[PDB]
Amino acid sequence: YNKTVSINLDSRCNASCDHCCFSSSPTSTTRMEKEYIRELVTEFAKNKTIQVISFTGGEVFLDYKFLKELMEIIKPYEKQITLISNGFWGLSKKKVQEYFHDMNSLNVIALTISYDEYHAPFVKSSSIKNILEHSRKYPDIDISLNMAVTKDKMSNHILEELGDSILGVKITKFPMISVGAAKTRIKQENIHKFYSLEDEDSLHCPGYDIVYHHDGEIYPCASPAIFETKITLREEYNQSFERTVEKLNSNLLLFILRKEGFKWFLNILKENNKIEEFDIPYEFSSICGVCGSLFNSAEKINYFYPYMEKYYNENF
Amino acid sequence: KENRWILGSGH
Ligand SMILES: Nc1ncnc2c1ncn2[C@@H]1O[C@H](CSCC[C@H](N)C(=O)O)[C@@H](O)[C@H]1O
Ligand code: SF4
Ligand code: SF4
């Protein structure tokens, strides 16, 4: 898990989406210091094993001068970069031309644009079209359109109104993770339920991907669900990426989760009649929904400790 | 994929 790394630059956003896992808004104050981010980016650019550095937020294009400065630190080291955005900047075709020219000269291999009914009150449809259309001139940048949907807001009209600008773009519609603003602003009956506590043989984490988050912590993945858990890989302020990777690979909870799946933790709670006590939901939109509910408090994580200790002595 | 949900990713 040492070929890719992500930095969440800021919780500040121009939008205030009702589903946002971070509850991002123009008044969001959670972020790592700029100088600290410059040091992480310099270290990741100098690192011999890292191949891809991804930036996320918040809205990364909100402070474009700082994003371009971070992309320029990486440039001499020839690392690949990925970006994700709400495309607010697409309003001006000249601005789009400038940003695509910069991304192309700064080894940006992928750009994901998020647009759906939750993003629509904050960004015009025409702004997204401008970015999608200009991206045709840059075939080496992989373009994607991510649409977060609910049963009442399926984004069926958003796609029609995008017209032919979506031709050749990879579109993925996905359900909500019940975290951040989605917990309180969206009715749970509107969140699609694809999994239950009984089909445990399908609850396997897709894999680890290191994220240095805007709360100053380090997470083993970039799923919206992980940020509400107490699973952090940070032990000190100045921690190297080698140490982060060493901790990820020696974390007993994450090792058991990867090797045994969620059913190992769910069966412990069922055996000890702790499902109601831990507020484990019966149905969920995805596998990450189980993750968040198993580990979103220090009590929950610590609860598994003697069972994980028994696993370590028995195996290994 | 879930592990790269809040990130841009190449095809
Ligand atoms: N509760 C939630 N469940 C599922 N996806 C969510 C979510 N909260 C946010 N997302 C999605 O996570 C992605 C990254 S959010 C941060 C990047 C940027 N502001 C953007 O909007 O793209 C977006 O596609 C967003 O729709
Ligand atoms: S989903 Fe993206 S655009 Fe919407 S509030 Fe969250 S960070 Fe901002
Ligand atoms: S939230 Fe849990 S299941 Fe989902 S990607 Fe992260 S570690 Fe894996």
Q: What residues are paired with A144 via a beta bridge?
A: A112, A170
Residues 6+ apart with CB under 8 A from A214: A8, A9, A10, A11, A22, A30, A31, A32, A57, A58
Pick from A158, A157, A173: nearest CA to A285: A173
Q: Find the domain containing A236 and state its range.
A: 4-308
B3 CB neighbours in chain A (<8 A) are: 205-209, 221-223
Element (H, E) at A161: helix A156-161
Residue A131 belongs to some domain of the structure: yes
How many angstroms separate the CA atoms of A302 and A307, rounded?
A: 10
Cα of first residue to Cα of last residue in chain B, in angstroms, is: 11
Residues 6+ apart with CB under 8 A from A277: none
Residue A247 belongs to some domain of the structure: yes
Q: What is the DSSP letter of B7?
A: S
List phi, psi (to 5°) of A300. -60, -50
- The region that residue A23 occupies, defined by phi over 0 for left and psi between -120 and 50 for alpha, beta otherwise, is left
Residue A285 belongs to some domain of the structure: yes
Query: What's the domain count of chain A?
Result: 1
Using DSSP's 3-state secondary structure scheme, residue A154 falls into coil
Element (H, E) at A160: helix A156-161
Pick from A231, A197, A191: nearest CA to A211: A231
Residue type, A134: H
Using DSSP's 3-state secondary structure scheme, residue A171 falls into strand
Residue A238 belongs to some domain of the structure: yes
Q: Are A284 and A294 in contact (CB under 8 A)?
A: no
Residue A229 belongs to some domain of the structure: yes
CATH of the domain at A284: 3.20.20
CA of residue A195 relative to chain centroid, distance: 21
How many angstroms separate the CA atoms of A306 and A88, rounded?
A: 49
Write the secondary structure of A203-267 as one string of H (helix), E (strand) and C (coil): CCCCCCCCEECCCCCEECCCCCCHHHCCCCCCCCCCCCHHHHHHHHHHCHHHHHHHHHCCHHHHH
Pick from A237, B4, B2, A77: nearest CA to A142: B4
- Angle subtended at Cα A18 by Cα A13 and Cα A19, rounded to the nearest 5 degrees: 90
Q: Are A84 and A56 in contact (CB under 8 A)?
A: yes
How many angstroms separate the CA atoms of A13 and A15, rounded?
A: 5
Q: Pocket residues for ligand 2 (CB within 6 Å)?
A: A 13, 15-17, 20, 22, 24, 57-59, 86, 114, 119
Q: Are A58 and A180 in contact (CB under 8 A)?
A: no
The sheet that has A142-148: what strands, in order across it? A170-174, A142-148, A108-114, A80-85, A52-56, A4-8, A211-212, A218-219
Gyration radius of chain B over CA positions: 6
Residue A313 belongs to some domain of the structure: no
What was the experiment behind these coordinates? X-ray
Residues 6+ apart with CB under 8 A from A90: A96, A123, A126, A127, A128, A129, A130, A131
Residue A287 belongs to some domain of the structure: yes
Spell out the alpha helix ranges (H) of A34-154.
34-46, 64-74, 93-105, 125-134
Residues 6+ apart with CB under 8 A from A2: A49, A50, A210, A241, A245
Residue A264 belongs to some domain of the structure: yes
Atom number of ligand 3 nearest to Cα A254: 7
Residue type, A205: C
Distance A191 CA to ligand 1 centre (A): 15
Element (H, E) at A80: strand A80-85
- Asked if A206 lies within 8 A of B8 by C-beta distance, the reply is no
Nearest to B10 among A21, A110, A177 (CB): A110
Q: A16, exposed or middle or buried, with CB in 10 Å at 0-12, 13-18, 19+? A: middle
- Angle subtended at Cα A67 by Cα A79 and Cα A57, rounded to the nearest 5 degrees: 100
Q: Are A212 and A8 in contact (CB under 8 A)?
A: yes
Cα of first residue to Cα of last residue in chain A, in angstroms, is: 21
How many angstroms separate the CA atoms of A71 and A78, rounded?
A: 10
Task: Work out the minimum CA distance from A121 to partner chain B, whole angstroms.
Answer: 20
Q: Are A52 and A93 in contact (CB under 8 A)?
A: no
How many angstroms separate the CA atoms of A68 and A61, rounded?
A: 9
> How many Cα atoms within 13 Å fall on the side-chain side of residue A82?
25
Atom number of ligand 2 nearest to Cα A20: 6
Strands A283-284 and A195-196 come out as antiparallel
